[PDB]
Amino acid sequence: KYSIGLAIGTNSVGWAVITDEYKVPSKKFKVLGNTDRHSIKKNLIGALLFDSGETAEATRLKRTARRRYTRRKNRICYLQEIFSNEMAKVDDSFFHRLEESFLVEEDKKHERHPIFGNIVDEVAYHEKYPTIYHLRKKLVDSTDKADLRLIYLALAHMIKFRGHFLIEGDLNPDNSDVDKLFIQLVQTYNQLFEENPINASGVDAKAILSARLSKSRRLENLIAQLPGEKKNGLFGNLIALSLGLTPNFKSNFDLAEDAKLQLSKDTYDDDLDNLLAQIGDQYADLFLAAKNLSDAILLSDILRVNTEITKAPLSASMIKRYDEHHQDLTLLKALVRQQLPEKYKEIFFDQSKNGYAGYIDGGASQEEFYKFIKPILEKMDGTEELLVKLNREDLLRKQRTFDNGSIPHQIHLGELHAILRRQEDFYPFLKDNREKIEKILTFRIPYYVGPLARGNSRFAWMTRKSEETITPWNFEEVVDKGASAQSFIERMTNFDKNLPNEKVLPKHSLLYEYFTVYNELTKVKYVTEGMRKPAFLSGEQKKAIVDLLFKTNRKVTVKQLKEDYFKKIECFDSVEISGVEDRFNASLGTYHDLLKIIKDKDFLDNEENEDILEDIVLTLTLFEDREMIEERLKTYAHLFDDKVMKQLKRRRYTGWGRLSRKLINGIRDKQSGKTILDFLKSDGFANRNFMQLIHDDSLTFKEDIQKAQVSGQGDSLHEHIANLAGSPAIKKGILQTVKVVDELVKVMGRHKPENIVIEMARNSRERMKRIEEGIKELGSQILKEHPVENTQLQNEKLYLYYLQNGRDMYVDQELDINRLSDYDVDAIVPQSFLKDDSIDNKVLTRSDKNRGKSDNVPSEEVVKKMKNYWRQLLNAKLITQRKFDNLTKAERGGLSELDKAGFIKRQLVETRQITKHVAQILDSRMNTKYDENDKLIREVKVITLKSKLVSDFRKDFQFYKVREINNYHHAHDAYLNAVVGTALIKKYPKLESEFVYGDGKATAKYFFYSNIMNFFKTEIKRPLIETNGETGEIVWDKGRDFATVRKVLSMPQVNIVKKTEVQTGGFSKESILPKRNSDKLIARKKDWDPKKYGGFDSPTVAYSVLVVAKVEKGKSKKLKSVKELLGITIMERSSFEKNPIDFLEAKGYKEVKKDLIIKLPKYSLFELENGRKRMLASAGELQKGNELALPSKYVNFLYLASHYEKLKGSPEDNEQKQLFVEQHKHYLDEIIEQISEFSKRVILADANLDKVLSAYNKHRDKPIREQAENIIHLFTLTNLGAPAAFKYFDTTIDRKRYTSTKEVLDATLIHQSITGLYETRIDLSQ
RNA sequence: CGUGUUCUAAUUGAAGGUUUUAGAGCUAGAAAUAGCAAGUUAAAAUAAGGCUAGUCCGUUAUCAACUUGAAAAAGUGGCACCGAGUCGGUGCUC
DNA sequence: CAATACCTCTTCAATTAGAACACGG
DNA sequence: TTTAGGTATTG
């Protein structure tokens, strides 16, 4: 006789229970435990809060990291295992010192000095070769045998930090001189293209190409010197290509299909080559000439140093950085001595202040130290060039800085190679292992290979040819690499909804194509002059149509049918076709795709070869990497010409279908012995449809399927709640709410509800890049003209201006950067139709009156001027298809009366699909009973509501919701949603299809919805009491019921249950604190004394436990008795459970009482004394446990007082509210007294409270809007949970935390329900 | 069907940061002190660590209590009424 | 004791897959 | 992107 309404949010879940007259019931419960009480009475409405659920994204980037960090450790491992024999010969302990290089001299086992043991020599190496990049030049240059331990020393370093694989190819650093290389291209292109010459013109190609200027520009700067060549003309692309780019010369050679080329991209050498043959072999020389330049320029940025001396340029730049520090370090210090020597300690000796002494020795970034000395360099004189260097960002470079990592790995490998080549003569073992050693630097598992697991990884999927250990060297052979690649993908791709078991067919499969075609053809009707009835296409006719027309054309069209087949074959001079649009919707595209590739039409037609064409496409869809693609294209390799095969690889396919293969031809109807495809070709008689067939009872197809949906019988609840497409947090809630219902029903005597009413409610650097790119494609200097910062664009009217590129969207005029305030944000589509605050639906222009009518999308006039302008933006990606299409809409007829009706509806019916399964799951769990007909006995209605019913209802009925005041409102919001949705479908059963779960003309529809919520009101002239005119049933009573709502709303006691959740996650703050004399510090590794070595700190605690036990005090070690809290940290927790006592004793608690220990999750609740209540938060601290049941009038009063966004109300009413603000303006004192009395009673943090009071007291003069909003601020001290910062108008009130758990220890412990209804109460004295 | 954004799940890379150690500091001066020279680099751990010993796994999800289960998860607590500062009383069942 | 006041690893690359959602045709 | 438990500091 009751109904349950619930609110499901990210962090909260609101529930309620309602009588037959919208009252809320009031039951007396039991209370297990030792306390005197044996029952308590509580209301039937409330909310269960919790911590927001957390996504796996951080955890995965950890998952990734750990797999990542160790592999790098492994590379440093293979060098040693290569080296071990020859290193012991040379040195016994070199490797041992390195492993133990970290340990303290006292704990050091071998000689402290890693490289040579001796103190004297190590000093020597460090001063001939002071930075490891001074050593890296030597052994790529020197032709004199060198100490092996220096050689390994070089090698690991490159391997440990190796360079990025963004670019894959081979680099011959014979490319140092760009000018020479470029000029050589001018030559070979002239020879190729005698007719139109190029003249070199003495461009500082090295100078032009070399420069930092943006990549697109340089090719422009180069073509600005040429005498009159087009940018995109053949030369231009080539030039553009060497510089990293993906130009296109398809337009100069008019290839039918676009021919795009990246040197960097893996698919280049063939790609040009696959292309190159197609333009003649002659050019091929031209591109290589281009690559050779690319190599010389490509590396240009790492070193501008003359190539000619050095075969190891990259390392050389670092030596250069070192020198350019030194003299600028002498000259700075020297200059400071020359001027302002007095302030010289701060700059160098003192770490704290960002001084150079800070820079080397303190936590001072390169950007933190450059902006410290900025005044000083400027203040100083004789420093002028120095200034220039810094502005360049070159002032005092360090060898490791954030940027490196635009160093490709192929010079780090360029330099590994030089060393081996250099010294393999001295040492035979290198030539034996040069390949291995290079392979260590070279080798990266691909993504599709996955973790090299052996059956123990939830994550990994690879499969093994040989079970021997995998080493970079043996890799291809051990891993079933291709097969593994098909495994990568076949776990993230779909299964048929109809058939769970069969994995979905790829999109470009011929069979889907013979299915789509034969299906769209099944319902073609045709008529001619002679016939009585227009009739279906016959089986003979369809096959004839598919074979002739479709197999001959990509697209088959209506008059292709009329004249090509009927006239040619059936000779109907003229015909009428009912079935189709201008052309058939499907096409036999894949059939056509192939015909071009292999040119054997009968082959495609032949049935026997048909499983090849699906295992061609399943392999062509399935794979990304062209080398990978080849492997399974060998299996069918024998038949085709070699020339085709090369062609075959290129046309890769994408996307996947929804239909399987046993469907389309998989299953056979028993009586008719035909599969759907069979059915589709030749069904009739009548030509049945896929949909039809799947519901033809006469047919077995529905029946057979029936088993398929059933198999596995669904899955248990979280197994299902964790597969719904949505927020991780939202799913957590979805679960929690059902755990509420099964109680609320359990509570209501296991009596199922009449109605269950559900609601759900609804970047800093992202803005920077999108603009960054957009201007670049646009090429405007507007970004240059005015620059801005990454922290600035959370303000739209600023941010919008940039996407619009400083021009009026509706006006074609430039914009005032400074006075954005005068201008107006305009939402393209009016808010009344839809509520959109997105960058997608907003625009900024001076006046929002130039778009057009208030009541429509931007006017035809607006589109005409700037439709074109809107294209530059879309291409720039400065706007979007959603943003664009609406903007251009008006020429689409804009918003029809049909459109408007649609928006007004969607405000009220929830179409959000995440809120659907949730609705569905309730119905399924709730209604299990089955009637004699297959039909379902729906005994609980489910209802989904949009927020706007309830949110508006408070606005129009004096039920205002103030979020800040109490955590209660989340619970009122079920109640309202309960009675709203119950009373709705008691007046309009017709809407039950829309509002409840289970199976032009618009203008009126607009009316039907807009006024739907009228009936509650007395005047809009409505009768007080509502009814169903059909059933003669009462639904509403304006007088009695409204009063009831107020009675429910202001109820003093609501159930508010912070979920007790055990803490999880990282053990402690990731930061590694320096060695300290503290027992707080945690030893980073099991041997490493943090007093000695440093450690972590700040461990989080998965749950605390009360030990009532004894410890010894004093020399006597007398055993006293304690009862304290011991938090068990998350490192510790695993250890605890194996045995607590042994673990507990270890801490030193003695004669621990085994039975007494009680696990306490974070957020546990104790009520001590006055009814002041507290939630555990950490072992040492507790949280505000109390809620404020503010009498409503104060709740109502404030909402108006804050006066949010001024007033949105209808004008006459606004007068009505205001007097009451100041009739009851004295209420403000009432509120403070309410906080003031309560704060004294429960919050119990007086030291602050006087402080708070005073702020209000001296601000009595200030207006209510000011004072009024702020009192709302002041609620923050009050609120359930943990202290945070807050202020009155300018006065900031710091928090007061609760610093020990002692006061809990002889107090009541409350273990409540998932609802707060059932409790068990524990008086802690013992 | 086409397209596009957004968000989620997985995999495989790069660059910094941090932490002890190694880069013979000197000149005075009994000393705290005070004069100047030096600084740019490397090694190593990078969740403690687990057994299934992999170039594997190690921060998501799920969690009142009590009886019971390995775990999953099943089982446990009268009703009415009048009233309201976090549930208080009444009558009834019991 | 419990009042104040500081601290909290970061920023980039590449590849697949699928909902969900909103424009067009 | 800011909270809200851990840390040692000062009165």
Side-chain angles (χ1 to χ4, degrees), chain A residues 764 1076 1078 1162 1178 1183:
Chain A
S764 342
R1076 219 219 292 161
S1078 209
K1162 169 153 152 156
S1178 193
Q1183 279 181 353

mmCIF file of all heavy atoms in Angstrom, chain A residues 764 1076 1078 1162 1178 1183, chain D residues 1 4-8:
data_model
loop_
_atom_site.group_PDB
_atom_site.id
_atom_site.type_symbol
_atom_site.label_atom_id
_atom_site.label_comp_id
_atom_site.label_asym_id
_atom_site.label_seq_id
_atom_site.Cartn_x
_atom_site.Cartn_y
_atom_site.Cartn_z
ATOM 1 N N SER A 764 41.584 22.065 -18.278
ATOM 2 C CA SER A 764 42.301 23.326 -18.209
ATOM 3 C C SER A 764 43.239 23.480 -19.385
ATOM 4 O O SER A 764 43.341 24.549 -19.968
ATOM 5 C CB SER A 764 43.102 23.409 -16.905
ATOM 6 O OG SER A 764 42.645 22.473 -15.938
ATOM 7 N N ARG A 1076 65.572 11.306 8.007
ATOM 8 C CA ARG A 1076 65.098 12.082 9.130
ATOM 9 C C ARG A 1076 65.178 11.191 10.335
ATOM 10 O O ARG A 1076 65.165 9.989 10.201
ATOM 11 C CB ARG A 1076 63.638 12.482 8.903
ATOM 12 C CG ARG A 1076 63.260 13.889 9.345
ATOM 13 C CD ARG A 1076 61.875 13.936 9.977
ATOM 14 N NE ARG A 1076 60.814 13.664 9.016
ATOM 15 C CZ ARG A 1076 59.586 13.287 9.340
ATOM 16 N NH1 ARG A 1076 59.243 13.133 10.607
ATOM 17 N NH2 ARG A 1076 58.702 13.058 8.392
ATOM 18 N N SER A 1078 62.912 10.071 12.456
ATOM 19 C CA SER A 1078 61.512 9.867 12.790
ATOM 20 C C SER A 1078 61.156 8.410 12.631
ATOM 21 O O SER A 1078 61.684 7.736 11.765
ATOM 22 C CB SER A 1078 60.629 10.700 11.877
ATOM 23 O OG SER A 1078 59.428 11.064 12.518
ATOM 24 N N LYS A 1162 36.569 3.397 8.041
ATOM 25 C CA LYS A 1162 36.549 4.838 8.053
ATOM 26 C C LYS A 1162 35.093 5.204 7.945
ATOM 27 O O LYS A 1162 34.327 4.467 7.368
ATOM 28 C CB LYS A 1162 37.291 5.358 6.833
ATOM 29 C CG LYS A 1162 37.129 6.834 6.560
ATOM 30 C CD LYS A 1162 38.332 7.389 5.818
ATOM 31 C CE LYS A 1162 37.949 8.577 4.959
ATOM 32 N NZ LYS A 1162 39.093 9.490 4.685
ATOM 33 N N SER A 1178 40.326 8.614 10.619
ATOM 34 C CA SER A 1178 41.702 8.147 10.530
ATOM 35 C C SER A 1178 41.874 7.629 11.932
ATOM 36 O O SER A 1178 40.994 7.829 12.756
ATOM 37 C CB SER A 1178 42.681 9.296 10.225
ATOM 38 O OG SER A 1178 43.995 8.869 9.840
ATOM 39 N N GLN A 1183 35.223 12.907 12.852
ATOM 40 C CA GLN A 1183 34.479 13.855 12.024
ATOM 41 C C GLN A 1183 33.090 14.237 12.558
ATOM 42 O O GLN A 1183 32.459 13.459 13.259
ATOM 43 C CB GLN A 1183 34.332 13.286 10.615
ATOM 44 C CG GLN A 1183 35.546 13.473 9.728
ATOM 45 C CD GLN A 1183 35.331 12.913 8.347
ATOM 46 O OE1 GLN A 1183 34.326 12.271 8.084
ATOM 47 N NE2 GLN A 1183 36.275 13.154 7.456
ATOM 48 O "O5'" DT D 1 42.450 22.156 -13.967
ATOM 49 C "C5'" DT D 1 42.622 21.270 -12.855
ATOM 50 C "C4'" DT D 1 41.516 21.454 -11.806
ATOM 51 O "O4'" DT D 1 41.100 20.154 -11.295
ATOM 52 C "C3'" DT D 1 41.902 22.240 -10.555
ATOM 53 O "O3'" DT D 1 40.702 22.790 -9.923
ATOM 54 C "C2'" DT D 1 42.547 21.153 -9.694
ATOM 55 C "C1'" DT D 1 41.660 19.932 -9.993
ATOM 56 N N1 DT D 1 42.426 18.601 -10.020
ATOM 57 C C2 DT D 1 42.152 17.585 -9.072
ATOM 58 O O2 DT D 1 41.308 17.681 -8.172
ATOM 59 N N3 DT D 1 42.919 16.437 -9.233
ATOM 60 C C4 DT D 1 43.897 16.200 -10.216
ATOM 61 O O4 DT D 1 44.523 15.129 -10.274
ATOM 62 C C5 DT D 1 44.122 17.303 -11.164
ATOM 63 C C7 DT D 1 45.147 17.185 -12.270
ATOM 64 C C6 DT D 1 43.386 18.418 -11.016
ATOM 65 P P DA D 4 36.685 16.765 2.100
ATOM 66 O OP1 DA D 4 35.568 15.838 1.779
ATOM 67 O OP2 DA D 4 36.468 18.099 2.733
ATOM 68 O "O5'" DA D 4 37.730 16.029 3.022
ATOM 69 C "C5'" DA D 4 38.351 14.847 2.593
ATOM 70 C "C4'" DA D 4 39.576 14.596 3.439
ATOM 71 O "O4'" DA D 4 40.657 15.426 2.939
ATOM 72 C "C3'" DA D 4 39.396 14.971 4.923
ATOM 73 O "O3'" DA D 4 40.060 14.045 5.746
ATOM 74 C "C2'" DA D 4 40.058 16.345 4.987
ATOM 75 C "C1'" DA D 4 41.205 16.113 4.020
ATOM 76 N N9 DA D 4 41.907 17.306 3.551
ATOM 77 C C8 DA D 4 41.767 18.593 3.990
ATOM 78 N N7 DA D 4 42.585 19.441 3.414
ATOM 79 C C5 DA D 4 43.328 18.645 2.552
ATOM 80 C C6 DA D 4 44.384 18.922 1.652
ATOM 81 N N6 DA D 4 44.891 20.142 1.451
ATOM 82 N N1 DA D 4 44.910 17.889 0.975
ATOM 83 C C2 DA D 4 44.414 16.666 1.174
ATOM 84 N N3 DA D 4 43.412 16.288 1.965
ATOM 85 C C4 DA D 4 42.919 17.331 2.639
ATOM 86 P P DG D 5 39.434 12.593 6.067
ATOM 87 O OP1 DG D 5 39.681 11.710 4.908
ATOM 88 O OP2 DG D 5 38.008 12.739 6.438
ATOM 89 O "O5'" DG D 5 40.305 12.160 7.365
ATOM 90 C "C5'" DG D 5 41.190 11.000 7.357
ATOM 91 C "C4'" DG D 5 42.693 11.319 7.093
ATOM 92 O "O4'" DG D 5 42.895 12.586 6.432
ATOM 93 C "C3'" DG D 5 43.657 11.319 8.300
ATOM 94 O "O3'" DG D 5 44.430 10.069 8.294
ATOM 95 C "C2'" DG D 5 44.546 12.562 8.084
ATOM 96 C "C1'" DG D 5 44.239 12.975 6.647
ATOM 97 N N9 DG D 5 44.344 14.427 6.428
ATOM 98 C C8 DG D 5 43.370 15.354 6.703
ATOM 99 N N7 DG D 5 43.716 16.579 6.431
ATOM 100 C C5 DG D 5 45.012 16.477 5.952
ATOM 101 C C6 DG D 5 45.887 17.492 5.498
ATOM 102 O O6 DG D 5 45.676 18.711 5.432
ATOM 103 N N1 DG D 5 47.106 16.979 5.092
ATOM 104 C C2 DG D 5 47.443 15.652 5.116
ATOM 105 N N2 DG D 5 48.681 15.354 4.680
ATOM 106 N N3 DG D 5 46.627 14.675 5.537
ATOM 107 C C4 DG D 5 45.427 15.161 5.942
ATOM 108 P P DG D 6 45.518 9.693 9.430
ATOM 109 O OP1 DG D 6 45.279 8.278 9.855
ATOM 110 O OP2 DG D 6 45.461 10.771 10.441
ATOM 111 O "O5'" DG D 6 46.949 9.722 8.663
ATOM 112 C "C5'" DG D 6 47.301 10.824 7.802
ATOM 113 C "C4'" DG D 6 48.807 10.979 7.645
ATOM 114 O "O4'" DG D 6 49.084 12.306 7.123
ATOM 115 C "C3'" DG D 6 49.619 10.879 8.937
ATOM 116 O "O3'" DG D 6 50.938 10.443 8.660
ATOM 117 C "C2'" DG D 6 49.635 12.311 9.412
ATOM 118 C "C1'" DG D 6 49.759 13.078 8.098
ATOM 119 N N9 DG D 6 49.138 14.398 8.186
ATOM 120 C C8 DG D 6 47.901 14.674 8.718
ATOM 121 N N7 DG D 6 47.591 15.939 8.706
ATOM 122 C C5 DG D 6 48.690 16.543 8.141
ATOM 123 C C6 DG D 6 48.901 17.886 7.881
ATOM 124 O O6 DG D 6 48.124 18.825 8.116
ATOM 125 N N1 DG D 6 50.160 18.105 7.295
ATOM 126 C C2 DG D 6 51.077 17.114 7.000
ATOM 127 N N2 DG D 6 52.233 17.512 6.451
ATOM 128 N N3 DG D 6 50.879 15.830 7.245
ATOM 129 C C4 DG D 6 49.668 15.618 7.817
ATOM 130 P P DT D 7 52.043 10.369 9.830
ATOM 131 O OP1 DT D 7 53.009 9.347 9.336
ATOM 132 O OP2 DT D 7 51.378 10.136 11.126
ATOM 133 O "O5'" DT D 7 52.703 11.859 9.894
ATOM 134 C "C5'" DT D 7 53.827 12.216 9.012
ATOM 135 C "C4'" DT D 7 54.338 13.672 9.170
ATOM 136 O "O4'" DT D 7 53.302 14.625 8.841
ATOM 137 C "C3'" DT D 7 54.798 14.089 10.558
ATOM 138 O "O3'" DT D 7 56.136 13.739 10.756
ATOM 139 C "C2'" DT D 7 54.655 15.610 10.527
ATOM 140 C "C1'" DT D 7 53.639 15.879 9.418
ATOM 141 N N1 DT D 7 52.404 16.573 9.931
ATOM 142 C C2 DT D 7 52.243 17.923 9.691
ATOM 143 O O2 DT D 7 53.031 18.593 9.027
ATOM 144 N N3 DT D 7 51.103 18.457 10.223
ATOM 145 C C4 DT D 7 50.144 17.801 10.969
ATOM 146 O O4 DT D 7 49.155 18.369 11.400
ATOM 147 C C5 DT D 7 50.389 16.402 11.204
ATOM 148 C C7 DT D 7 49.426 15.595 11.997
ATOM 149 C C6 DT D 7 51.494 15.864 10.692
ATOM 150 P P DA D 8 56.760 13.882 12.226
ATOM 151 O OP1 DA D 8 58.031 13.111 12.249
ATOM 152 O OP2 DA D 8 55.631 13.614 13.149
ATOM 153 O "O5'" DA D 8 57.136 15.419 12.354
ATOM 154 C "C5'" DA D 8 57.853 16.037 11.308
ATOM 155 C "C4'" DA D 8 57.764 17.543 11.408
ATOM 156 O "O4'" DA D 8 56.375 17.969 11.555
ATOM 157 C "C3'" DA D 8 58.501 18.128 12.601
ATOM 158 O "O3'" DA D 8 59.137 19.300 12.203
ATOM 159 C "C2'" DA D 8 57.379 18.407 13.599
ATOM 160 C "C1'" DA D 8 56.272 18.837 12.669
ATOM 161 N N9 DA D 8 54.936 18.722 13.256
ATOM 162 C C8 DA D 8 54.499 17.797 14.176
ATOM 163 N N7 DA D 8 53.235 17.944 14.520
ATOM 164 C C5 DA D 8 52.816 19.034 13.763
ATOM 165 C C6 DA D 8 51.573 19.708 13.653
ATOM 166 N N6 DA D 8 50.472 19.373 14.342
ATOM 167 N N1 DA D 8 51.516 20.758 12.801
ATOM 168 C C2 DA D 8 52.620 21.110 12.116
ATOM 169 N N3 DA D 8 53.827 20.559 12.127
ATOM 170 C C4 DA D 8 53.862 19.521 12.982
#
